[PDB]
Amino acid sequence: MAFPKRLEIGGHALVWSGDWSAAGARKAIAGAARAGFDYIEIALLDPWQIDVALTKDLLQEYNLRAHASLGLSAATDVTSTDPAIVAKGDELLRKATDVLYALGGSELCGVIYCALGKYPGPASRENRANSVAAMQRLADYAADKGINIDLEVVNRYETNIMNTGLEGLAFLDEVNRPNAFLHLDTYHMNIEENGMAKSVLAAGDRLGYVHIGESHRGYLGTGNVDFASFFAALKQIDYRGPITFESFSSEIVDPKLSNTLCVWRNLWHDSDDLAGKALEFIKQRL
Amino acid sequence: MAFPKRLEIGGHALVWSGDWSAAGARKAIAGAARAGFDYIEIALLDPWQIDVALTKDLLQEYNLRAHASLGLSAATDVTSTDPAIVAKGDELLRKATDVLYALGGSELCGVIYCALGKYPGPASRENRANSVAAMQRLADYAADKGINIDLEVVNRYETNIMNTGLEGLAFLDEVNRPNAFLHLDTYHMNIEENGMAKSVLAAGDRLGYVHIGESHRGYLGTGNVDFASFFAALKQIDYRGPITFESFSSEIVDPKLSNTLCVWRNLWHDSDDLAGKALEFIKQRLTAIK
Ligand SMILES: O=C(CO)[C@@H](O)[C@H](O)[C@H](O)CO
Ligand SMILES: O=C(CO)[C@@H](O)[C@H](O)[C@H](O)CO
Ligand SMILES: [Mn+2]
Ligand SMILES: [Mn+2]
């Protein structure tokens, strides 16, 4: 079975903090709460680094919910033809699920099905088969802990496995798990999709998670994304799931994410101004 | 001085051919000619590969003009803190210029100012200064051969040096050469620009070259690019320069370029259909009285 989802608006941690130190965690949770988000999305690329007790304390202090996203790396790539590397991926994904479970969360999303970043060539049948089997194992592990997994479709420079919602849905057909969902991100859609509606309408109840990012990943409404068409499509399918505002500036750097995402430019410096305008922007389109 | 530019529409070689063998050169030049393009843009990532005499004969046979684009690689990266790698870059750029000159061409464009692809971190002041100095030396070499150079602004995953038109213009001011121009590409703009007009309007006469690519680099008008604003901008600055249709499908693969551009998807397989529809699309928006 799937676990409950609700329409709720979140902020990604990199809007506020490049780390999850006591100070970094507080800055991000306080920032999301101040802006009036329902949840913070924690970037769990190293799930062993996060102090669960400290994080639970901060979420209670600020009356805030948490979901988690991550990308794997070459060392943890579940697409790998090296079985030791796939096993390191399974291990990281189980640890991320355990952290989310300890925080009382219900959603593990993002690039959980491969290494986030540049592949040297196209995926083989083996790469894909390895990824599908890894997401079956992860879905089954998460199901015991009341957690849905949401497979984020990202652009060609960030994966060779799935670059469109339609490809994502075909992948999910092969996974065939009730608690495995599609995750769409307007920034990635802006590059790869034939308009901003087709993949949402095709996905229907299988769309489990949404990222809102401008074309340049900066202030919403200052770039090229057709948000009107995207939000109309969400209304058509009566979408009732997480919507995270996601934005990257050289102002706030995570050394293990920011260089992978090639965030060379400062698109903003005022985290509170950006987040506050992002939430208002999203609520207006709902 | 700058060298003459004209409003002309071209097709990128990779629409037809992944190499420049006799058969490959003919397929691309015949293809560009059959679609009704004014010129072919030859990908010179390895300028020592080109049979110049064969290519000159083909361009004459089909009454077609040629421009050239390229990207450097790690071994030829003019941003490098290794002077030996910068020297290899200078040498490749000179050879590309020599090929274009022999073919009677006037435009060397694309990612001529760094290695095309993913950088592991942001560019240092030294990376940028090395690139600027290299583009000055290239501009001066090209100027003796009647050639303009056009620095192609590309997205964050393909360079760390310049990702917007506005960044391109500041870099170009540091180069300070009259035959050096900004080169904008709607595919890259779709990621990095605040709308499709700002950089064009800011560039004015400094815009020397244009690439037309859909958001996904497939059929024009099947993606997300606001071409209406882009072409409105070109009209407002009375743009008079090359406009190349550029498209990448796994159907046609240059091993030197296709994997760097992460072309994982086949968005087309009929070169003539893609190129014919692209020319129609571009012509309509150039004459579009709006
Ligand atoms: O869109 C992206 C990456 O481009 C993020 O959503 C990614 O999944 C990362 O894991 C965030 O933590
Ligand atoms: O836009 C691009 C690369 O994404 C091409 O135009 C590139 O500059 C190269 O010069 C092609 O040969
Ligand atoms: Mn995202
Ligand atoms: Mn281009």
Author numbering:
A (entry chain A): 1 to 286
B (entry chain B): 1 to 290
Paper text:
The X‐ray structure analysis of l‐ribulose 3‐epimerase from Methylomonas sp.
The length of the C‐terminal α‐helix was thought to be involved in tetramerization and increasing stability; however, the addition of residues to MetLRE at the C terminus did not lead to tetramer formation.
